């Protein structure tokens, strides 16, 4: 499931929490969208939900990486983002 976002002055416009040690869902060490920022790209184009598992960003694997390591990959984006999401896979999917 992929979501193209246009990165801008508010970033991508969401907040993530997940990664090695920051696992949002017990048993699922993936990056999870924990908040979505007002007027953010992911709030407008994003069609994204709080609780979404990020597989990758610009198809760079976010699967079991350190939170800061992942966030840096989403941060190093400019005016375009290809967000790769899956719903909670190793846990209760929704």
């Amino acid at each position: 499931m992929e979501i193209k976002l246009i990165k801008g002055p508010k970033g991508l416009g969401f907040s993530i929490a997940g990664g090695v040690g920051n696992q949002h869902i017990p048993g699922d060490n993936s990056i999870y969208v924990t908040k979505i920022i007002e007027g953010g790209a992911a709030h407008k184009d994003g069609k994204l939900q709080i609780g979404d598992k990020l597989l990758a960003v610009n198809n760079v694997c976010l699967e079991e990486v350190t939170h800061e390591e992942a966030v840096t990959a989403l941060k190093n984006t400019s005016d375009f983002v290809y967000l790769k999401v899956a719903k909670p896979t190793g846990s209760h999917h929704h």
């Binding site: 991508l12 907040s15 993530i16 929490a17 920051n22 924990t34 939170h67 800061e68 966030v71």
Partner: peptide, 11 residues
């Protein structure tokens, strides 16, 4: 160590 575990962060 800017972004961290046990906390969410805006991208």
């Amino acid at each position: 160590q800017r972004t961290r575990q046990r906390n969410e962060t805006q991208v």
